[PDB]
């Protein structure tokens, strides 16, 4: 049934897929996903945080 247990990669990526599809359904009332901007822009946030960490490591060395 349901309860705390163990799960595989294919299950977790499938869950993330359904989460993104529900997010698009909620925000935009469409469910066609030939392109999803949501992934693109959360990856832009990830790039922001990664660049922040990179420049954080860069300024540790010289002065």
């Amino acid at each position: 049934g349901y309860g705390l247990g163990l799960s595989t990669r294919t299950q977790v990526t499938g869950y993330q897929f359904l989460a993104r599809r529900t997010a698009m359904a909620l925000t935009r009332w469409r469910v066609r996903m030939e392109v999803e901007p949501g992934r693109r822009q959360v990856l832009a946030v990830v790039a922001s945080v990664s660049a922040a960490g990179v420049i954080c490591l860069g300024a540790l060395l010289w002065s």
């Binding site: 247990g5 299950q11 869950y15």
Partner: protein
């Protein structure tokens, strides 16, 4: 011979009789009263008796009498017709003034020229009590701020307790089945004096942790109110967002004694991250749960054909019960709950990001161009983000947030600085930028852009989204700290 069978209405009971279809009314109305009286005595009801002067005479349902010298068939009476047996003072009682009136506008216009219904009076009174208690709590908080004393804290507590008890008694259904509005308005309004009293309980000039505890108790009270009532999800959701941010900022203020600029910047980063997780959180809070996956069950065909919800008619009068589809009806209700939560998140994050960008004080010389550039990037962020939302009030919330960031930074520079150039630039952006928004709203839906240009305008969103984190770290001077510490 032919006979007609009709239902005589007399003394509020229905009596079926058989009547000659071809004799005149006045011939057969003499034994008919005897038959009706005999039936009434069988039923044990007070028999028909005349008073004054007049005749026994049969009227249709509207009251028009039958012609007494004509048979039933000559007056178009058929089987199963209902006739009222009455004693009338005169033989003439028609009302022949038929009148032409358009029924659509007649049944329409009455409800919107309606006078003041006392349910509206109760709602107005509850609203104005809400405004009054909010003004009282605000004045008590202002007195506690200006005049550090033990006086305002118990008085706000008493008012809060009495208002909440009154509101709960209203919501206790003893006085309110249909208008939860009164109870919700009073309940929401009474929470603010409670938070004011709790904050004023702590010593010091301010409420001792710079009023962490007031915002905290306000937030948790709103969370519990949603947990128990669940009606006004958007409003309490926005208030919970504001209270959560204020409590986090205040706890970092008293624990770490860090600068207010650092606090505003990290709260800004929190809202920036939170705008992207807002659809997910609205899904999660609404109770929408994506289906559990079969881990090891080999069976995949389930012919269980789930049963029917029988929605009993709310009158409870034995009416035929209707049927919804299944348990999955709650997907609808959780769906409007999710929309309400998401609208609340957008409003609250909008307020927080407007407040955080009011941390731009001095003119642009020196390092002050960096937070202004951060404001510009977040403006482009929010104004392009609105494509991702379809419902009008969410899109308006994002657009309004974007333009209010510019409005707030401009008014702060023109008020704090005494430079006429700053004033001219501020009034110039105030008049041009929403005018540009109006022109964009007028032109863009009515013209057909190149897919290339659509890709660039798609990419300004991402390109202004990216550089805001290093600018945030520049404003927090974490880079210089790592340079020196």
């Amino acid at each position: 011979p032919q006979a007609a069978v009709v239902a005589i209405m007399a003394a509020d009971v229905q009596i079926a009789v058989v009547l000659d279809a071809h004799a005149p009314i006045s011939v057969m109305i003499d034994p008919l009263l005897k038959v009706v009286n005999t039936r009434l005595r069988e039923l044990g009801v007070a028999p028909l008796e005349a008073k004054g002067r007049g005749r026994w005479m049969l009227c249709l349902v509207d009251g028009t009498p039958l012609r007494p010298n004509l048979s039933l068939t000559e007056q178009e009476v058929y089987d199963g017709d209902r006739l009222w047996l009455k004693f009338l003072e005169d033989t003439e009682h028609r009302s022949e003034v038929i009148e032409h009136i358009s029924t659509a506008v007649a049944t329409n216009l009455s409800k919107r020229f309606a006078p003041i219904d006392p349910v509206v009076a109760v709602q107005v009174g509850a609203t104005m009590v809400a405004v009054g208690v909010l003004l009282g709590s605000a004045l008590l908080g202002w007195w506690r701020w200006q005049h550090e004393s033990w006086l305002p804290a118990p008085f706000a507590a008493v008012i809060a307790v009495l208002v909440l008890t009154v509101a709960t008694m209203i919501l206790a259904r003893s006085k309110t089945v249909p208008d939860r509005r009164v109870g919700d308005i009073l309940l929401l309004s009474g929470l603010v004096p409670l938070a004011v009293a709790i904050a004023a309980t702590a010593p010091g000039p301010v409420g001792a942790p710079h009023a962490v505890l007031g915002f905290g108790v306000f937030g948790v009270a709103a969370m519990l109110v949603m947990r128990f009532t669940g009606r006004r999800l958007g409003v309490y959701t926005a208030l919970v967002t504001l209270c959560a941010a204020a409590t986090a900022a205040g706890l970092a203020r008293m624990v770490l004694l860090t600068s207010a600029v650092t606090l505003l910047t990290c709260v800004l980063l929190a809202c920036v991250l939170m705008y992207h997780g807002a659809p997910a959180l609205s899904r999660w809070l609404s109770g929408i749960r994506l289906p559990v996956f079969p881990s090891a069950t080999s069976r995949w065909v389930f012919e269980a054909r789930p049963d029917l919800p029988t929605t009993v008619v709310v009158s409870g009068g034995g009416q035929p019960t209707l049927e919804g589809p299944a348990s999955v009806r709650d997907v609808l209700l959780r769906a409007e709950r999710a929309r309400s939560f998401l609208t609340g998140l957008l409003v609250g994050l909008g307020v927080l990001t407007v407040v955080c960008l009011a941390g731009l004080c001095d003119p642009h010389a020196g390092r002050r161009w960096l937070p202004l550039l951060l404001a510009a990037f977040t403006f482009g962020f929010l104004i392009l983000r609105g494509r991702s939302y379809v419902d009008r009030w969410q899109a308006i919330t994002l657009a309004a947030t974007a333009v209010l960031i510019i409005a707030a930074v401009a008014v702060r520079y023109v008020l704090v600085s005494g430079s006429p150039a700053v004033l001219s630039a501020g009034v110039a952006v105030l008049v041009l930028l929403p005018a540009a928004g109006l022109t964009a709203a007028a032109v863009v839906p009515n013209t057909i852009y190149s897919p290339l240009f659509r890709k660039i305008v798609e990419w300004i969103e991402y390109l202004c989204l990216m550089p805001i984190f290093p600018l945030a770290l520049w404003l927090m001077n974490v880079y210089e700290a790592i340079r020196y510490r």
